[PDB]
Amino acid sequence: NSDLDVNTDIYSKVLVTAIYLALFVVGTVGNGVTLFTLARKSRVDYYLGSLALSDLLILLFALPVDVYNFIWVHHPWAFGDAGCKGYYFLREACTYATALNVVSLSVELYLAIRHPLMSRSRTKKFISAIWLASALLAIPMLFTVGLQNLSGDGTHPGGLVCTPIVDTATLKVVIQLNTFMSFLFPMLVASILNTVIARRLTVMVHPGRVQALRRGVLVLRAMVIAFVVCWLPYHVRRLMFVYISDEQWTTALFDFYHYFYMLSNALVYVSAAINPILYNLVSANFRQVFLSTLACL
């Protein structure tokens, strides 16, 4: 089954791998210590913790499977049907949860800057609601991807790959679903909200709350722009994967699709690693307790 092979150079594999491992350690340590101190510590801490969990899931259970079975060995898939579906399901649920957390944070900040409720119980209930909804919107992937023997006769175990098992139309529908619901719409809402939040901050600012508020505004805007920039090439690739006709696909577009895969996923991990570092760059006491928690290791 030499038709399933790709020609991505070794140096690119090693480079992208090294990047993935760097983002792995930075992201896991960052979000791990983040969850640690946040748990040891306030309304936004639940959203931040939710984000940290969302990132940790990808960094721990999606990153190794990716770096192994997607850039190093393209075939055969060695995680089974359950691993195949559970992987993409996890990814989708994660991106949905992240997006919804961002938008929710935008709303919370706007309300905390326009009028300066949501008790601890109610807030946690709402976070649970976000997670559940995220899991619900990730369901189609369980019915979209799967295992297929793409070898010449469909009998060779080396041709057992993890590929979408549904037709082009349905694939279009689910990919569009993900792109609209987890990217365009929510980040649009969050961008508008951030836009209003900025000027509201400028008009409010004309004692110690306004500085933390400014901090929150900058952090939030940073998270939004990071989300857009990082998740942009990701959604373009998935649309590129399906919308291009089978006759239009050439070897150049193939190899380029794989390099683009490397790039896009690299940025995807860059986001998950960029979440906690932004919390440190504000020079808040969070960085102090970050070094404090990082020291005892």
Binding site: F70, Y88, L150, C162, T163, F241, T250, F254, H258
Partner: peptide, 7 residues
């Protein structure tokens, strides 16, 4: 000629 199988 050939189409990707990785999503």
């Amino acid at each position: 000629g050939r189409r990707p199988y990785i999503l």
